[PDB]
Design a binder for this molecule. Structure first.
Ligand SMILES: [Mn+2]
Ligand SMILES: [Mn+2]
Ligand SMILES: [Mn+2]
Ligand SMILES: [Mn+2]
Lengths: 198, 198, 198, 198
């Protein structure tokens, strides 16, 4: 049974970059649905599996990836953010970033274009390629999770679905991404990096 | 050279079902981009084509379907709506609807579920299947246009991208669709039906 | 605990439309592999589901749809063929075919175009739409099963993967389609058709 | 005005790894069809583009990517093979392979897994990433061309469509992969590799 994780902070702790109304809706409504629906899909999948109904299992795939992916993605998203965040990472991660994308601004520039480049709903990701031993930037459609669909290990995620910024930034997604750099929780991203870096 | 079509009405003429702020943004910002970008893609496609650059042509496909589809879809969307709309269609169309989906509410119910069922960005469509001689309901991802990707002829379209309702209805898409029935321009939908019905 | 169905006839019971060699491999080799891989996949599934591992569940989807569908499709395919097969259906099924497609001949033309239409690996199908209550034609890529992927009840499927004819009919698929019509087991298609009518 | 490339060697210049029959058909028959269909498609294109017909442009996409890509892929494929082919690359290319993949052997293992990994029709590729400035491996479904679909510069492609081995190596693709390594024209791969380095 999956659970909606409590936020690591106040809904309005990311002001003015991401406002409280968006965080509240995002967490209490959007994320909450995914969790609920994921639980309903898993329950049904177990039923199909138990009676060897392959058709059922396959039909339930779109819902499981969507809601399951939604849950995975947002749970990480909350942790990637912080009220005292911003700035740049340090240590190995920063060296990895400089090494892999050139500089820190080059990193930002690449991830920004990857996120702005999403046509429709999706996410922008900074991930770790375990087989290449280096970092990597990717974009995922809708709620397709980074690791489950690409193998990469999620480090930092940027939700570019319109519900993630329209109320505040409206159509101008670029303003949304320039704004989000001020609340990245490099402390958590580093943790995720050092985590799979071994 | 493609052009952003003037609206057939006042940005606030669809109140309270679809508010003015959404219509203004939707038309002046979202639709306007698609048009602009479509023109830029077509220009570049002509260049690729002229010099036989197949790689270029293929790479430009995502942008052409997206922006081109965006343009097609919204241009129809504006016409499907009206301040004096609502109610139900009459004549053949209504008979076609009753014949094809049962009743009018059954029609609404089916199209509503098709639109609410869109995972991520997309549209809900009532179309005409020229080869089957009957009506048909379909959903399209992102900006993929009805006719260009399915062959069906668009009659009524329901934009379910979040920018189409989030500012007003927030996460509750169902409220958005129940609301939009009050502004359907059956007069234009009928025109489109009688148009391909011959 | 899915199992390999015994072929309904001898590996060469369909000469000369489809030689015993194509049947031999296609069944003994590839169908078996699909079943084996399927059981292996479902097992990894029960495991991941019990652990609440969503990422793993999503990662197992390509293998589950591909192997469970390959098993679904081919199991149906075998029963859709027969030595005494050929000609055309009688009763209700024929009536539905004339009504829904005009004539059994235009029908074959339809399915053939759908089947010959498949770019790459895939299947052409004659399925039944529970919703609309009538026959419908569809093409499915790779091993995506008709029902789990579209909800249509399969009645008659035509495997158009190159492995289903490339030996005998080489790169000319039409030759394969033209031939296969001589084998179709209309007795089975009718049973499937009747199972979903009332 | 795309044209059919003359094969670099005789249809049987690659015996016994790939018989002259597979080459014969694959080239004379299918590559030719891709070129012909491509020219036909581009023409319908210039037409639709001149008319400003976006719907038609979008409808022509499957045929354009499929036929222009089939032409792109196979043209490259031919040059990637050679009688005197086999063994391994020297100089920079080898160095990059060891560096980026560990060892030419793990490399082959990689490409093979990618190539054997393709479920359905497709291609396994050894392409170069301009961005990151190093080698990368990728798989493409059906005829989707590597560069137009991923932006990676193709260096070495391995056709894994059943028509490329089903005659000779039957349903066991590994056998085909294992064999093809004996033919690869590392002299060409190096030229392609060098063309995009500086
Ligand atoms: Mn979100
Ligand atoms: Mn819109
Ligand atoms: Mn098969
Ligand atoms: Mn080929």
């Amino acid at each position: 049974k999956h659970s909606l994780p409590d936020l690591p902070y106040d809904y309005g702790a990311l002001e003015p970059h991401i406002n409280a109304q968006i965080m509240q809706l995002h967490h209490s409504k959007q994320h909450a649905a995914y969790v609920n629906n994921l639980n309903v899909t898993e329950e049904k999948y177990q039923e199909a599996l138990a009676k060897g109904d392959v058709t059922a299992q396959i039909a339930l795939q779109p819902a499981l990836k969507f809601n399951g992916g939604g849950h995975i993605n947002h749970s990480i998203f909350w942790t990637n953010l912080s009220p005292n965040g911003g700035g740049e990472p340090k240590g190995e991660l920063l060296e990895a970033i400089k090494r892999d994308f050139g500089s820190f601004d080059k990193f930002k520039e690449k991830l920004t274009a990857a996120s702005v480049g999403v046509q429709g709903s999706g996410w922008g990701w900074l991930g770790f390629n375990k087989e290449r031993g280096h970092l990597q930037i990717a974009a995922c459609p809708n709620q397709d999770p980074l690791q489950g669909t690409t193998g990469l290990i999620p480090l930092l995620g940027i939700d570019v679905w319109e519900h993630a910024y329209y109320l505040q930034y409206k159509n101008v997604r670029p303003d949304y991404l320039k704004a989000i750099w001020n609340v990245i929780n490099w402390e958590n991203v580093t943790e995720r990096y050092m985590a799979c870096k071994k």
